[model samples]
Target: LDGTVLLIDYFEYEREKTKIIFDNIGEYDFIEVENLKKFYSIFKDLDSITLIIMDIAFPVEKEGLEVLSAIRNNSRTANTPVIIATKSDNPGYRHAALKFKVSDYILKPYPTKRLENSVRSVLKI
Candidate 1:
C-alpha cells in the first residue's frame, strides 16, 4: 500500500500477529495500537493514514463499535476508510456497523491474504 495503515487492537499478542500479517503482505506501513487510549494518541498525529483496521473488542468500557462511531462522527477523520473485525454473525451487529458506515467487516479468523486484499482494495494499491 502507499499509505499508512492503522491496526487497532487491545490485545498485546495480536500486535505480533498483525506484524506477521504485514510481513505476509510484503509491503505496507502499519502501526498497532493496543488500547483505545493508545489509538486516540496515535490517531491524533496520523496525517498520512489512509485506512484503519480495528478490532471490535477494546480495553476500555468502550467497544470497537463505539470507537468506529467516534471516528465516523469526527470531522477530521470522517472520510477515512475503516474496517472492523468481528466474531459475531448476528444480523443486528452487521446492520449496526453498516449504519456506522464501515468500509469493511472482517470475520475474526480471516486469513492474512483476505485481510490484505480488503486493505488493498480500500487503499487502491
Candidate 2:
C-alpha cells in the first residue's frame, strides 16, 4: 500500500534534514511544505497520508498551532495522527497541542532513537 507523510516546518535546514529519519525507516512518500498556505492546499488533496510531523513555529513565529488547528478542524484530517517535533517545551505549548489530541510530542534536538520510536508507535509499524 502507498502512504505519504506530511512534514511542515519553517526552518528549511531542519525541514530538509528530517528526511533521513523517514528514509532510514523505509521507503515512504514524503512531502515537506514550507508555509501554511501550501500545507492547506496539499492536505486537502491527499488521499492516504500515514502521518503528520509539524514544528511549533512553522511558517512564522508562534504560528504552528494555527496550522495544527486547521488540520484538526478539517473533517478530512481530524483523526489523523500528528507528531509535534519542535524545540519548544513551554508548558503552554504542550498544553495547547494536547488539546487538539496530538498523538505524540518530540522535543527538538530530538534523539533519533526517540524520534524513530515515536514514529513507529504512532504509525504502528
Best-fitting candidate, scored by TM-score: 2
lDDT of 2 at 29: 83
User: Each candidate's lDDT (Cα)?
Assistant: 0.72, 0.79
TM-score of each: 0.78, 0.88
Off by over 4 Å in 1: 24-26, 59-62, 88-90
List candidate 2 segments past 4 Å from native.
59-62
Residue 73 shift from truth in candidate 1, angstroms? 2.1
lDDT of 1 at 107: 77
In model 2, residue pairs whose N, Cα or C atoms come closer than 3 Å (at least 3 residues apart or on different chains), thus clashing, are none
Error of 1 at 3 (Å): 2.1
State the lDDT at 65 in candidate 1: 69
Superposition TM-score, candidate 2 onto the true structure: 0.88
Q: Over all chains combined, what TM-score does candidate 1 have? A: 0.78
What local lDDT does model 1 show for residue 26? 53
- lDDT by residue (tens digit), candidate 1, 23-123: 75556687888787787775656665677777765643246668788777777678888887655556666677788777788876778777778766776
